[PDB]
Amino acid sequence: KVFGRCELAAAMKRHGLDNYRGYSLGNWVCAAKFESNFNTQATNRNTDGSTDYGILQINSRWWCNDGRTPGSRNLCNIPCSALLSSDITASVNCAKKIVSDGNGMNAWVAWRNRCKGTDVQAWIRGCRL
């Protein structure tokens, strides 16, 4: 399921994501926009062996569980398949353990590299948030 930019902005904002740990909602639609390009089931294989899942590309080494990463954790205690989910609740109740942990959104490299230091607001620009 490809989220519409604003359909997503809403959804995120629905799960109290909009500004969680000081990240303006525009900071999540953008990270998502690149991490996954808005595809709820965006799977990108990671070098080391790990796997980035769903909308906000949450690595399976650490957060989700996939059965294929010898010695990788599952803190959010969930099967990544549950991240690919069309409903993005999980991915978000999960993209908090990723932004609350300590490194902020610099976890999502695509945000750190493509968003961090830009017009994030210009990402919800149209969104009736």
Curated annotation (Swiss-Prot):
Stored SMART domains: LYZ1
GO function term, MF aspect, one: identical protein binding
Active-site annotation: 35, 52
Classification via SUPFAM superfamilies: Lysozyme-like
Disulfide bonds: 6-127, 30-115, 64-80, 76-94
Summary of the tissues where the protein is detected: In the egg white and polymorphonuclear leukocytes.
GO process annotations (BP): cell wall macromolecule catabolic process; defense response to bacterium; defense response to Gram-negative bacterium; defense response to Gram-positive bacterium; killing of cells of another organism
UniProtKB keywords: Allergen, Antimicrobial, Bacteriolytic enzyme, Disulfide bond, Glycosidase, Hydrolase, Secreted, Signal
Coiled coil feature spans: none
GO cellular component, one term: endoplasmic reticulum
Domain C-type lysozyme, residue spans: 1-129
Reactions this protein catalyses: Hydrolysis of (1->4)-beta-linkages between N-acetylmuramic acid and N-acetyl-D-glucosamine residues in a peptidoglycan and between N-acetyl-D-glucosamine residues in chitodextrins
Pfam family, one: Lys
Assembly information from the UniProt record: Monomer.
Main function: Lysozymes have primarily a bacteriolytic function; those in tissues and body fluids are associated with the monocyte-macrophage system and enhance the activity of immunoagents. Has bacteriolytic activity against M.luteus.
Note: Lysozyme C is capable of both hydrolysis and transglycosylation; it also shows a slight esterase activity. It acts rapidly on both peptide-substituted and unsubstituted peptidoglycan, and slowly on chitin oligosaccharides.
Family: Belongs to the glycosyl hydrolase 22 family.
Name the record gives this protein: Lysozyme C
Gene: LYZ
